[PDB]
Every structure is written in C-alpha cells, then in structure tokens.
Amino acid sequence: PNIKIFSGSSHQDLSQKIADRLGLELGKVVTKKFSNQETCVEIGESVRGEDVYIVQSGCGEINDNLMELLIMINACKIASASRVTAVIPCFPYARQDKKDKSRAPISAKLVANMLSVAGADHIITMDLHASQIQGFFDIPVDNLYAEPAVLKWIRENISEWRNCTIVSPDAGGAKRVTSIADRLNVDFALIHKEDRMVLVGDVKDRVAILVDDMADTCGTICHAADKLLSAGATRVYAILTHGIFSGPAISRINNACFEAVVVTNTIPQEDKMKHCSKIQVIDISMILAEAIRRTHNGESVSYLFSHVP
Amino acid sequence: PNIKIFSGSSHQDLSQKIADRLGLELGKVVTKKFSNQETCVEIGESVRGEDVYIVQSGCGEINDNLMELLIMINACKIASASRVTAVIPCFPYARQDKKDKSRAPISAKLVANMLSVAGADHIITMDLHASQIQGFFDIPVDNLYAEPAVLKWIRENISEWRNCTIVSPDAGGAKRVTSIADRLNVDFALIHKEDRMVLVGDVKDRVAILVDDMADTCGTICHAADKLLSAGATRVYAILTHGIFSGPAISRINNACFEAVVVTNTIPQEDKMKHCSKIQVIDISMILAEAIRRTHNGESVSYLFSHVP
Amino acid sequence: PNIKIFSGSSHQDLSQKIADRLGLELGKVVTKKFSNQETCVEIGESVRGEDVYIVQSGCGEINDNLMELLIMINACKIASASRVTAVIPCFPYARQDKKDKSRAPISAKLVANMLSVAGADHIITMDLHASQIQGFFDIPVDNLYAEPAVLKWIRENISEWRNCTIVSPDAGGAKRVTSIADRLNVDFALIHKEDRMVLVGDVKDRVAILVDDMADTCGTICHAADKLLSAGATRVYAILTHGIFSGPAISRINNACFEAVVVTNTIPQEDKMKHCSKIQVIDISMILAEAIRRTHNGESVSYLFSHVP
Amino acid sequence: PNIKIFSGSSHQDLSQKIADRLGLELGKVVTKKFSNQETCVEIGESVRGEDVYIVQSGCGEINDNLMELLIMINACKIASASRVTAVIPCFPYARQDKKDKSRAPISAKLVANMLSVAGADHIITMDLHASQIQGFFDIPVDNLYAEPAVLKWIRENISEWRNCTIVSPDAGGAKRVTSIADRLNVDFALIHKEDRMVLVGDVKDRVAILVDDMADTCGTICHAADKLLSAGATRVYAILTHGIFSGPAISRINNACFEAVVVTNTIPQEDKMKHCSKIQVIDISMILAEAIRRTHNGESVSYLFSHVP
Amino acid sequence: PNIKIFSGSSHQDLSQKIADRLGLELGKVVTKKFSNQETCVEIGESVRGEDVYIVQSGCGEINDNLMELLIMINACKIASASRVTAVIPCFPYARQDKKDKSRAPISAKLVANMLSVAGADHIITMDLHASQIQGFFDIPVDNLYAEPAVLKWIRENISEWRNCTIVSPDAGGAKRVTSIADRLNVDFALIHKEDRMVLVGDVKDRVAILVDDMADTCGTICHAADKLLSAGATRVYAILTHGIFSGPAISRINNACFEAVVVTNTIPQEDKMKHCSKIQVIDISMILAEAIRRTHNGESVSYLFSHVP
C-alpha cells in the first residue's frame, strides 16, 4: 500500500507543497462542475489497495469544497482504496460546535457524520477551533498544532522576542497563549470586553504578540490591538493559524496598527496578500507532510506537537 | 521488521540523539573489554528479523572502535537479523584510498572488505574523503553530505554571508567549496602551496570561510587562514565536517586567527571544546536519523542532499 | 612458464611493438565477429601453464573491445593458463569512478569486477584516471606512469624547457603537473574556471606546457590554451598520456594555438594524425614491455616510475 | 515493494508493450553514449526498495546492449533496489555454450558470470538455445517458452493444421518439434545433412511447418525448405522464436519457397519486415508480462509453459 | 621465490630470532601510527614474486596488532607477493570460538574471515585454543605444538620428572596433559571445580606439573596449585604455552606456591619477568623457524609435532 495524494480545488498550492515534501506526484483526478453546477469528480488512476490522502481545506466556497471532498472520498472508497484519509487543514463549520440556548444545528457534528458516512477512515487537521470536535468522530482524528512553526517564526522574526508579551484576544484563547508563553519564557496577557476592553499584564515598552486560531472579520484582533497600543505597547503583532479574512477584514487590518499579521497557509493567501501588505504567511506544509508520512508508516504523530521537521 | 539502533562505544551521544529523533530506545548491548583487551560484545535483546543499525564512527581509538563495529555486525548477523547496516559518520582509513607510487596498503579498501565479510548489508556515512570509496564496496553505500547543515549554519551565524568568500584550503577541495558558493551565490577562492601559498580571488574587506571535509592536525587550515589574513580578509572562519583535531591541532587553532572553527558532530567534540574556545559544533544527527528512517521505509535518501529535515 | 603476448583488435600496432621489445611473436589468436556481431575468439596455440598477457586498450569501439578482452581472458583461463594478465593501456570507463549525488553506476568498478570474474589475475595499465581505481580490484594492479617518457620528450623537443611553466588545465590535475615541475625544476601554474578562467603563475615570455591524463573533446585544453595566450605566453604545448580525441576534438585542436599536442600511444593515433598536423606521438611500448618482463621475472616494476628503459 | 520496469535501448517497443500489460509506465532512465562511445546510464527515479525489471534483448549491437544491461543492473543495485531482475528475451552468446575440442571461450558462462557480478538476482528469458545455460547461473533463471503462442498461431493461421507435419531442420531441435507435434496431434519429421539432406516422414500433399529456436543466416531453414518442396510438400512454413536475420538471411528468405516466416518479437522486427514480405511476428509480450507479474506476486511461472494468458 | 620475513610491532624479538634461525634479515617495513592513531604501513622493499611471512602475535594492544597484521598482509598482496603467510604464534580472539546459548559473536571466525579477505594464503600458529579454529579457515592452517619443547624443558629442569604427575587444571585440558603423560611415562591427574576443587590421582610426595595452553588472569592455575599443595604435593610447577598474564595475574602468581611458571615466548615476556621472579621462558623460535622453512621448501611440517629441531 502506497501513499496517494489527491488535491481538491480549494488549496492546490498546499497539496503540491505536501506532494513535493513526500517525493510524490499529485494523483490524477478531475474535479470540475457540471453545467447545472453539480460537482463532477473522476479519479484518473487506480487507487485499489492504496493509502489515499485527499487534501481539502474549509475555505473559499465552503459548501462546494466540502461536497467535493465528500464526493472524492466516496469515489476512492468505492474504488477499493485500502484506506482513505481526509487532510482538512481548516475544518469547516468548526465554530458551530454547540447549540448554547439556541435552536441551532451542531454543524460541526453534521460535517463529521457526513465525512464518516462518505467513507473516511482517518482525519488530519490543524488547530481545531475546539478540540472537542475530535469527539464528534468515531474514526481517529489527528489535530496538529501550528505552535512549533509559530515559535520558529517568532524567534527568527521578532528581535525582541525574549522581552515580548503573548496576548490572548479573549478569555477563550488564553490556554493557547499560555502554551506559547511557556515555550518562549515570556509574559502572557489577557484581554476581554466588559464596547470597552480590559487588559491584564504589563505591556508598556514591550512588543505584544496577539495569538489566535483564526481571523475571520478581524474585529476581535483589531480591537485588541487598539487596546494594546492604548496601554503603551511598542509594536503589536498578530499570529493566527487560520487566515480566513472574510468580509471587511482586509480594510480593518489595513487601518489597524499591526506591524504584521502572520497566518499559516492552511488557507490560500495570495489574493489577500495583494490587497494587504502586512499579511505574512508561515508554511505548515512540512507539518502536514510529516503527519501524512508518519500515519502511513505507523510512526508517532504526536512527536510533531513539539518538533519542527 | 522494525528499526533497532545499537551504539558502539565511540560516539554514544550521537547514537542517543539519533535514537531520540527516531523515537526509539537504544538497543541493549554490552560492549566492554576482556582482561587481555579483546573486545567483548553481547547483544542483550533478540534482533531476529529486525532492521539493525549500528552507529560507530572512526574516531578515538580507531582500531578498537573498528573491531568493535565488526564484532557487533557479526553478532547481529549470526543472530539472524534481517538486515544489518553500519552507520559510520566518519569512515576510518578513508585517507588511505590509493597507493600512489608507494608500496602501501589501500587500507580503505581493506576496511570495506572487512565490513562486507563481517556481514554488513548497507553502509551509511557522511562526507567520505573520496567518493571513490563507494566503489570499494559491493553493497550499497549512502554517502550523506553535511552541506545543507553547513549552509544553514552560515546563514544563521555569519551576518555578512551574502558578501563572503568561500575558500578551499587546497586544490583538492575546490569542488566542495564551489558547490557551497553556488548555493549561497557568493565568490569562491582557491589557495595552494608552491612553504608559500598563493591565493586567487578577492578577499579584502570580506569575510572568508574556509571549507573542508576534515581537520586532523589543522596545519592546512591554519596556513590558509594566515594567508587569508595576509590578503586583507576581515574575518576568517573554518567549517569542517569532521573535527578529528589530533596532535597539535588544538594549540595551532588557539594560536590561529579563526573567528570560529565549526565542525559537525560526526566525531565527539566535548573534550576538544574544553581546551579550545572557538570550536563550535553543528548537529547532524537529524540528517543521520532521516537517512536511517528513509532507508528503512524505502523513501528517497538523496532528497537529503539538498534539504534540511 | 613462458611469456605469451596476445593482441586484441583494438591496438595491434602497440601489441606488435611490445612483442618485438620482448623478443617474442604475437600469440596465434583469431578475434573476429560472428554474423550477428557477437565476438568470436579462438586461441590458436596451447597456453597451458603459460604466463599470458592480453593487450587491449579502452579505445575505439569500447564495448566491443572490452567484451573481446573478457572473452579472451576467459578462453585463456579455461585453457589452463598458469596466469592471465590484462594489459590495458587506457582503462575503459575510468571516468565513471564515483556516483557523486547522482543515481549513476560506478562503471569502473563494474569493469573491474567483470575483469576479475573473467579470470584476470593481474592488471597492467597506464595513468589511471583516478588511482583509487586500483582499490576497485582485489587482484594486483600495476598503474604505470607516462611521466618519464614525457620528461624525456620535453627535454629533447622544447629548447626552452628550463624556463618553461608546467600548467594544469584544472585543479584536479595539479598533483601531476607539480610532479613534472619537480622533476624539471621549473615553475608550475594552475588554471580553473570561475565561462571565464583564472590563471595563477607568471607565464609571460615563457613556454607553457599543459599536462593531462587525457584529451577527449579537448574543450578543457583548448580553453586553457586560449587563456595562456591571453596571459602573454610565448608558445603553448599540450601533453596528454591518453589521446582519445573524440567528437569535435580534431577541429578544435586545428583551430587552437597549440604548437604541438603530444600524446602517448596508449590509443592508436594514425587516423587522427592524418587530419591533425600538430598531434605528435610518444612511444610508451618500452615501458609496457619492461613492465611485462619485470612482472614475469619478479623484478621491481616501480623502478619504472622514475627510469626510462 | 512495487514493480519498476526499465527499458534498455535494444527493444523499446517490447518494453512498452510489457509495461502496458502490467498497467505501469516505463521507469525514467537515460541510456545514451558519451562522446568516446562509453555507455552513459542515469536512473531518473528512486528505485530504493523496489522490485526492478530491466528489459534488454541480445540483439542489434550485442556488446553495446549487453554492457548497457550490466551498467543498468549495477546502477539499480547500488541504488538500493530490493531486487533486480534481468528480462533478456534473447540471451546473448547463447550459442557459445561449450568448447567442443576447441580452445574457445564458453561465452555464455562468461555472460552469466557478468550478470551475476553486476548484481542480478533473477533472470527471465525465452527459449534458451540450450537449457543447460540455466546451470551457468547460481541465481534462479526462468526460461519461458514461446510454444503456447506458436500453437495458437498455427491453429488460427494454418487451415490444414490438423493434417500438417512439424519438421525439425536438424537432429538437434527434434525434441522441440516433438513437443509441438504432441500438442497438435500431428506427424513430425526430421531432416539432417549427410551438402545433401535426408528427410524421414511423409510430407507429400501435406503442409510442413519447420520449427526452430532461431534463424540467424537462415541457411539451415532454407535448405530444409528446399528439401521439403523436393519431397512433395504442399506449402512450407517456418516458425522461429528468435528472428535474428543477420547477414544474407533476408535475401535467402526472399528467394526461398516459404509461405511465411513467423518469428516471435523477442527481437525487434520492423526493419526486416520492410525488406521481407513473408516475415510475420507473434507477440510474446503477454507471456513476458505475466512472467514478471507472477515472479513479483509469488505465483507459479511454470503455469505459463502450457497456458496462453 | 625467496623467503621474506616481516615483523609486526607486537613481538619484534621473536621475529628477529626466527630471522636469525633462517639466516635472513628482517624485511624492511615501516609500521607506525598516523597522528589520529590509524596504522601506517610501508613496505620498504619489493616483495614481488616472493614467499612472504609476517610475524605478529595476538598480544599487547590486540586490536592494534590485528589491524597492523591485516594491513601488512594487504600491502604485500597488492604488491604482487607470490604467497603471503601469517605467522601468528598466539591467535587473537581464539577463546571466542563459539556462542553457547548467548547472543555473542564468534570472534575467532570473524578474525579468520578477515585474515582470508586481507589476502592470507596460509596460517602458521601455535597451540590454538580449540583446534576447531582450523575449520574456521578455508586456507591451510598449520597449528604447531609447544609440547616437544615442553618435554625437553621438563626433562632438563625437573630432576624428579620420572616420578612427577602431570595435572590438568580443568576437564577441558585433560587431552593435552594425557599426551604429555604418555610421552614421559608418568601419572596424570585431573582437577575440576564442583568454589571447591576435586582432584583425582595420587600427588603426595610427588612433583606436580600443571599444564595448559594459556594463563590470562591465572585464577585457574592458582586455585589448582592451592589444591595440589593441599593434597600433599611436594612442589607444583605450571607450564603454559601462552603467557598472557593480564590483570591481576602477576600478583596472584607472586602470592602463589609455584616453584616456577614456565611459558613459551609466543608472547613477549620481558616486562612480566621484571615483576615476577618465578616466570621462565621457553624459546619456541626454532619450531616456528623450522615450520616456515618446511612450508617454503615443501617438507613435512607435522614432523615437528614430535621432534625438537
């Protein structure tokens, strides 16, 4: 059983980077639309008895990409692939992980059920919005972390990183920032709203680094950055694993005081970089490629939680 | 068939680093000396049907270490190991690779024959003194290169690396330096002796980096560094993959003008670092571990010739 | 046990010269081709209990000549010759002596293995491309040197030889030229490429003598000669032990500034001399004959490294 | 371990047919000549841990093709292929399988030794001239038979095949023809020379089918066909597994009385078909492909001795 | 072909004694260490067509001496010596001649393989620990016996030798002592441990002579001597062919009751004699010289099993 990497249409550059790191060519697949806009998928090579990995992120036209992924999984499964793995760098509907006093769907659970019923045997993803989403599955889920790559970027790009403060934009992400603060041996601050925000932790004359899983409309991080500059910070960075940047995010970032907005490439960023000078991209294709290769060879994946490959 | 890593007594720190990078514990082996100083080897665990890797460098008490390696290979082979690989970071007797108008042995060929007859199926080594030594074997030999790690060190440690000159100490190593000069887009200079040395290539007001496979007595690199300072160089570095440092090497380096003497850890360096402040060590255990893991899994090893893992 | 000299079809003039110097007639052998172009060999006399020497150079139709040599060795060995020696003035595939970051064969090692398995007990050759090729064998290899004959030619043909400069075309051959420069007590210069070439050593108003093991396409020596004339040299000679002269070599030499291109007769040269006026031939049949006679009589062969017989 | 099929330059059409029947693409390899006509081989993809099959027949420029095959085997073996198999449809030097009161080489044994020393683990060939050549190896040799394909051709092309006579051109091939005569339930005749030939077996008013392993100069089969027409045969066919057709074979066949000269495609035939109308080709690529696939999967190869796949 | 005797650095006095008995001078060889402690060997005279004997015992720095011997053998073999013989008075790793329910090497077999692959044609040794080691070779091995010299010493040094008892220290050596007891016409006793030892055979008022192949730490012979004095012996001698005397052997012998500890000079003894008064040395250089001369002249070597020359 050999590795076969297939790309959905969502993030083809990431799939190519992963394939190069694995020393493989992308599997032959046609993924287009019929005239009535139904997804058309044709696997152009035999996957019989192979270990198939389908790379598709929850970005762009999310429902189209999700249906493409489900259809590709189904096609590979009924084509007698030995194992089918969904590599989903940004998990769609992850923020709908609970009801919370509302007659709302748990869309993340529905997506997990659909992936299971399509025939996925395994899920590889990066920085799930809530790690409880792992429990939405009955198949194994490897939730990778961008934190090693983030730490690497911080050390090689922020000269004052030993005196910086890692800041959570809200009370929800504090855990994450504390982890980073522990790995860098720096202070960590929290910010939460009472339209006013309150900040705990000295940030004067120090570089502040907001850290988060995602930036969708960037209202949260822009408000946090305004507060950090109010409290005497020297420069404010924002580091996010998922740069969705929908709606007014680009305009707000352009009008914000960030020195840089670093995001990983779990979502393609070329279009946003055109209209926003201060967006920078961390490659995480090495982490994804190593996770694929370790799941295939039966090596430890959790080794990657703390080690940059 | 699983990976089993065994350490000879020559370089136990390197073996441990490799084992950690592989996520494995070192195999149980007793390697001591009988009273009459014959090597005693006892494999403390079953290696039947396993892929065995024995790590032993040509350093320290070279003949003792070589005999230890041969005895361990023999013990694993008659213990029904599926495959036995010798991981020899610094190949012993590599400099005796030819006769050249002398009634001399070709000791490198003798060592290759002894390794083959002991039962080695495969050799992993780093920067063979002459790559023709690969032809001394009939079994496959993977000759790894420290060059990716050297390039990484140069970029992250020499601030002026874009304006530096890579210098060969002699005409023999020019190929190597040209390779490095190609990967950095810098000038390359040669130095050869006519007790006088002649240098080709502008080095004034520029950082010079001597590059070589090994430093035994360091007469070559010390003379080259003196010449480089004569020709107006600003600082002179020396980068070698094998830091043997025998005889008067430490005193000469201490009396030399080197800013630093960077060597890889194919040979243990802790004792030399005690008596020489300007020696610095590049870890190459990641390259060796990746080579072991790729030979085991049937992935491409030559991928490592240009990529730091 | 008497000497029997057999000629392959590659270089019959050299075999005849060697046989005359030994006071012997060439052994009766038929070496032709079957209709389907397979080599046909028939030993026309008994070689039982004899010391057999088969002369065949790696020239012309190289694979045909090599197969002829292997077949003749096999025929003599199963005909109960006491000892079989391959006299190979120019060793085929000598330039494929290593892999060097390529998925390439080590063809020189393969040729050595084939010669050993055909039944060769001993190899006599001249100026191996790399002396490490000696280690590719387990049988003894005598690598003779054309240097004594070259020194003789230089003294008797270049009137200004005491003020000449011996020049290496590249960094690889410097050793050789230094040896010659030591035996003549003259200056030695190096030339290496950075499409531009750099020359170290005064050559103005002095005769320059490029020295090398072989000239295949003569791009190297022609570029070196152009550079030497640029640097004010009076006349430029080229002396090579192996005159392969394949491809465009004859046209380039005809368009080059060489006063003469001296080569030994390890490879037949009559055809090339027809189309190139400035090619001159040094006879080395005396060295080969003396080496054969000394190996037969158990006298010192290395005596020939410095003495013209 | 996957199948990798590599083509030598001798018979690229056959290699492509085999690759298509296996559902594979031919492995990336460069096989050209250096300027001095030495074979140049570069394996363009990793073969590490793979089951490598190199297809090269003993045809055309036989010594060049044989050296190409040996060099490719060596390149794959030192590139750490798990297993290397030589697929040699027509075995070179097969007719030099003995000495027989001559001081001649046993060239077939030399070729076997060279293949073994190059690193071949297994040989697949078709209709060895003498099956004793199998004993020239110590590695397994699968000698396939064209007889099933020949029987198929006879039944579907000769309408009178139930009343035909299978004829041996000489006493040596009688076994073969008897085998065929047994599988068709027809008469079998022998022909041997006393310049006159004597024929045993009624052939009047019956179609005669000469059968043989090879046709080199076609003197044997042309003389046999003349004798068969003398003895009242209606039509004479010739069926050979190896159509070498060297020397005057094409002219003799054109002047002969054969209805057809059927040969297998162990040797490329397109050029000969241009100048000879009555040559016809049986495809045996299915037999070779099935043999490769069965050796790879550990299924029975001898199943193919009697079954067309 | 003449005799050439070369000395390794292990036992130069023995080599000189052998050379004098042969009427020869020791061959010119340089055997030193490079700076990094690799063995350096240079044969200072032509050995072409000669019968070369290299004398090196398994004593002192055993792995260094063994590597020296292998390198010297290789140098002589590629220097076209007609025959190379290793004269190894004490065979290294002889006690590691089996595994015996342990995952241990058979180091003696490895040493034999290394000697064969270095190019040894013949082995001369004295009192192999187990004569089965002869079967570890495919080349002839002459295992000489010190017994004639021991018998001579006993008769000329022990006045009561006709009434003495020859004693084995263990059950393993009984054969040897019985041989001696047969040649002297005396009683023979055995001793074996049950920390207690049991002795069979009357030894009261009689001189006892322990006999053995080697004394390494001398625990065995010291315990045996204590038991012999317990059983009423008058004086106790110990005679060993190999006096290794490593570890605490000298102190134990000094504290033991031995009248004398006689050893042969297969291992140099001058240093041990300085610190131990009761060590005495039998010269066996006459046996070794006669064995060399008889192998050279084709005379019977086994003649020496019973005759002092």
Ligand SMILES: Nc1ncnc2c1ncn2[C@@H]1O[C@H](COP(=O)(O)OP(=O)(O)OP(=O)(O)O)[C@@H](O)[C@H]1O
């Ligand atoms: N794609 C989406 N874009 C924007 N809002 C979304 C999206 N999907 C779900 N939501 C809504 O966003 C809210 C979830 O917000 P969020 O994850 O920031 O906070 P939380 O889950 O309440 O707390 P926390 O993550 O801090 O523990 C819900 O009201 C949910 O319906």
Ligand SMILES: Nc1ncnc2c1ncn2[C@@H]1O[C@H](COP(=O)(O)OP(=O)(O)OP(=O)(O)O)[C@@H](O)[C@H]1O
């Ligand atoms: N361990 C050793 N320490 C020192 N010198 C050694 C050692 N082993 C061999 N030598 C000697 O060193 C010489 C080889 O030197 P070196 O490798 O620097 O140059 P080279 O092979 O002549 O040329 P180059 O490597 O530049 O092509 C030989 O004379 C060899 O005998």
Ligand SMILES: Nc1ncnc2c1ncn2[C@@H]1O[C@H](COP(=O)(O)OP(=O)(O)OP(=O)(O)O)[C@@H](O)[C@H]1O
């Ligand atoms: N017959 C041949 N003709 C031309 N090129 C060849 C031939 N055989 C091998 N080569 C190629 O030529 C190259 C070897 O070149 P060359 O011997 O001039 O330099 P090198 O070995 O890199 O260095 P140097 O000899 O200076 O130490 C390799 O790429 C090899 O594949």
Ligand SMILES: Nc1ncnc2c1ncn2[C@@H]1O[C@H](COP(=O)(O)OP(=O)(O)OP(=O)(O)O)[C@@H](O)[C@H]1O
């Ligand atoms: N390529 C070749 N082309 C032509 N003749 C060859 C070739 N190779 C060898 N020969 C010669 O052909 C003869 C072998 O002929 P052939 O195989 O037809 O008959 P055989 O071996 O004597 O008997 P049979 O095969 O009938 O049992 C030998 O003299 C051999 O030297």
Ligand SMILES: Nc1ncnc2c1ncn2[C@@H]1O[C@H](COP(=O)(O)OP(=O)(O)OP(=O)(O)O)[C@@H](O)[C@H]1O
């Ligand atoms: N150089 C050495 N010094 C000490 N012990 C050694 C040495 N080499 C091997 N040994 C160990 O010594 C043991 C062999 O002991 P010894 O030869 O005295 O007895 P044996 O082979 O069991 O029996 P015996 O020789 O009486 O038939 C083994 O355990 C072996 O590993």
Ligand SMILES: [Mg+2]
């Ligand atoms: Mg939430």
Ligand SMILES: [Mg+2]
């Ligand atoms: Mg949040």
Ligand SMILES: [Mg+2]
């Ligand atoms: Mg060297």
Ligand SMILES: [Mg+2]
């Ligand atoms: Mg050097």
Ligand SMILES: [Mg+2]
């Ligand atoms: Mg070269």
Ligand SMILES: [Mg+2]
């Ligand atoms: Mg060159």
Ligand SMILES: [Mg+2]
């Ligand atoms: Mg025949």
Ligand SMILES: [Mg+2]
């Ligand atoms: Mg026939």
Ligand SMILES: [Mg+2]
């Ligand atoms: Mg024992």
Ligand SMILES: [Mg+2]
């Ligand atoms: Mg004992």
